[PDB]
Amino acid sequence: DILLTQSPAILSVSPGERVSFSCRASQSIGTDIHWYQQRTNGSPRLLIKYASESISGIPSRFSGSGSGTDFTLSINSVESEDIANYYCQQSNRWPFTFGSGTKLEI
Amino acid sequence: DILLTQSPAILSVSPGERVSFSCRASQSIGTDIHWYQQRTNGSPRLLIKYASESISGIPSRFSGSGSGTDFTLSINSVESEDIANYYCQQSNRWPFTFGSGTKLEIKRADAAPTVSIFPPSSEQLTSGGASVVCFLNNFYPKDINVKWKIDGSERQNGVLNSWTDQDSKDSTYSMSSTLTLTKDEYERHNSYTCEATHKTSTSPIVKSFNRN
Amino acid sequence: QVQLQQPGAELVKPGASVKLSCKASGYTFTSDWIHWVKQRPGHGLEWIGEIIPSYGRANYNEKIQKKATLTADKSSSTAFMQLSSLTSEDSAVYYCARERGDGYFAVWGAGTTVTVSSAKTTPPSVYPLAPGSAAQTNSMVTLGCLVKGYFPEPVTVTWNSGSLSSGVHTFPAVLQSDLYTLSSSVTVPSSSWPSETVTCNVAHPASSTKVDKKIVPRD
Amino acid sequence: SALHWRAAGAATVLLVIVLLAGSYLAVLAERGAPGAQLITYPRALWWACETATTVXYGDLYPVTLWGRLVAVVVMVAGITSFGLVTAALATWFVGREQERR
Ligand SMILES: CCCCCCCCCCCCCC(=O)O[C@@H](CO)COC(=O)CCCCCCCC
Ligand SMILES: [K+]
Ligand SMILES: [K+]
Ligand SMILES: [K+]
Ligand SMILES: [K+]
Ligand SMILES: [K+]
């Protein structure tokens, strides 16, 4: 089953700076990657689907890029409300799988 | 997206020798690779397309080879006009991407600098300022130190220097050194001197001039 | 003739937005795509995006923040790139290039030097550089011209309208107190000057000012 | 001439048009989709040719919604035209045999 590697596990950025989360798949999965945000005590929330597609209700600040095995979730100018854990999830092959997660720290 | 790795970032070859630039793709891209040449202050110029196809107007000296993930750009007997940055670009998958680039550097015979000192122009004096300019031209290697002396005493303030990349005409380097003073500051001094200390000479090469 | 023409430069204040142009000439096909490439000083080529004029569709580099917006004008054969809310990070040379739908950039524009700064436009001061009366000469003589107090980059210096290229050195500009300065040198057979004129043509695109300065010996 | 021949010829000409249009439109639909390979015109024309004939080597194929739709149009045009040539031949052979008998 496809292994999704999220490294580093923790990221520290200064307020307003540009941050980038990385997700690496153990084999090519096209653009079948999706990103979720989970704040402390909250349930996961879909941020970006299919590597770069935006969801309605999500700040324009969030963007995604990549294809194949390497994927990135970017935030232009991070703010306090973005403090949370970030997970990638692939749907290219069964079974769906999740990356281990990256914590955003400001 | 396909990552194109160009390593080494700088290559040094002796005049006339055969040089080879390498481009490695992060996945197989057939022969969908293209090469560009960009000289100092110039725009990119297509050298080779589809890994090995020649373009008209480009010297026969240039050739390319490879397929899959590894590509090479070769130059049979490099010359001075080939001094520039070289980039690969792939068109196998969207989006097109460029390699980071390799700078071609040539190793020629040592050359002492040709020093020239210039007094501030008249059109400038009448403007309230004065710049004494010195050119250390066409020397090699590029390592070089310039010194200023006003009335015999070493000067440092107001000195701005600039170095040129390697010359595509003769593989040499050149540098300009400019000592800027105020019209007045310039008036209360006799002679100005520029001293050049280069590997080619155990003694400093100097050029002076008196404000009279 | 030059296939792609771009304005030499553009000055922009932080937060503002400027629109670059690329006027095409030569054969034009329905399969042509116009690309834009960003190159910062000392760095490599970074693809920004593309557009197919015949249809009006454009695509952009996903990996970077979207500062651009591409449009085209079929009647005037001009491709435009709108950059918005800029910062000093967006200061660089922006090239346009033409691709015939076959993957490679056959030809590029000369490039537009974009500078993001709150400073102000200022034409350069061009002064002569003639040898000092006590300077001895060999079979060659070196002359030049000092270009100072200009902003923003760049300036193009030619000798005798380009008819004299061999023996020239235009040094990189040194920035000091919101103003640039540079000099250019030229070497000709000492016996040929001043019998044969020598002038430096300094162009400053940013302020649309071209000026010549004949180089004559000192009184 | 006879209808079938007019229909067969017409659905050759139309096919050649679909091959060129289908080749130009696939590049338009596929550029912008990370990972896509049907992005330059020459290979796209080859792609359409191998699609219309239904050979499909798998060396190139659309990954976007629109590129795929275009693909379906190219498929139907090729299959349709080949079915119209076969039908035209049968008509020529049948009508021709009625004589030999
Ligand atoms: C805007 C409308 C576009 C319509 C499609 C036009 C496509 C371009 C023309 C075709 C080939 C040009 C050659 C070239 O420069 O490419 C070659 C480089 O080695 C390799 O060719 C190729 O490998 C592609 C081969 C395609 C064969 C198609 C056979 C159809 C009967
Ligand atoms: K079949
Ligand atoms: K088949
Ligand atoms: K098949
Ligand atoms: K296959
Ligand atoms: K197959």
PDB file of C-alpha atoms in Angstrom, chain A residues 2 6-7 11 14 17 22 29 38 40 44 52 68 75 77 80 82 86-87:
ATOM      1  CA  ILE A   2       1.186   3.504  -0.847  1.00  0.00           C
ATOM      2  CA  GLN A   6       5.367  13.896   5.640  1.00  0.00           C
ATOM      3  CA  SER A   7       8.658  15.456   6.730  1.00  0.00           C
ATOM      4  CA  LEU A  11       7.446  23.396  11.007  1.00  0.00           C
ATOM      5  CA  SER A  14       7.419  33.672  11.524  1.00  0.00           C
ATOM      6  CA  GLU A  17       6.002  34.371   6.123  1.00  0.00           C
ATOM      7  CA  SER A  22       5.810  18.360   1.844  1.00  0.00           C
ATOM      8  CA  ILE A  29       0.096   8.686  -7.867  1.00  0.00           C
ATOM      9  CA  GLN A  38      -7.037  19.517  11.915  1.00  0.00           C
ATOM     10  CA  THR A  40      -6.568  21.103  18.380  1.00  0.00           C
ATOM     11  CA  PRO A  44     -10.215  17.117   9.899  1.00  0.00           C
ATOM     12  CA  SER A  52      -4.056  21.802  -6.430  1.00  0.00           C
ATOM     13  CA  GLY A  68       3.817  12.057  -9.318  1.00  0.00           C
ATOM     14  CA  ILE A  75       0.324  29.037   2.673  1.00  0.00           C
ATOM     15  CA  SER A  77       1.725  34.580   4.690  1.00  0.00           C
ATOM     16  CA  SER A  80      -2.399  32.341  13.924  1.00  0.00           C
ATOM     17  CA  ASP A  82      -3.366  28.281  10.661  1.00  0.00           C
ATOM     18  CA  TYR A  86      -1.696  18.944   8.370  1.00  0.00           C
ATOM     19  CA  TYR A  87      -2.311  15.611   6.661  1.00  0.00           C
TER      20      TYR A  87
END
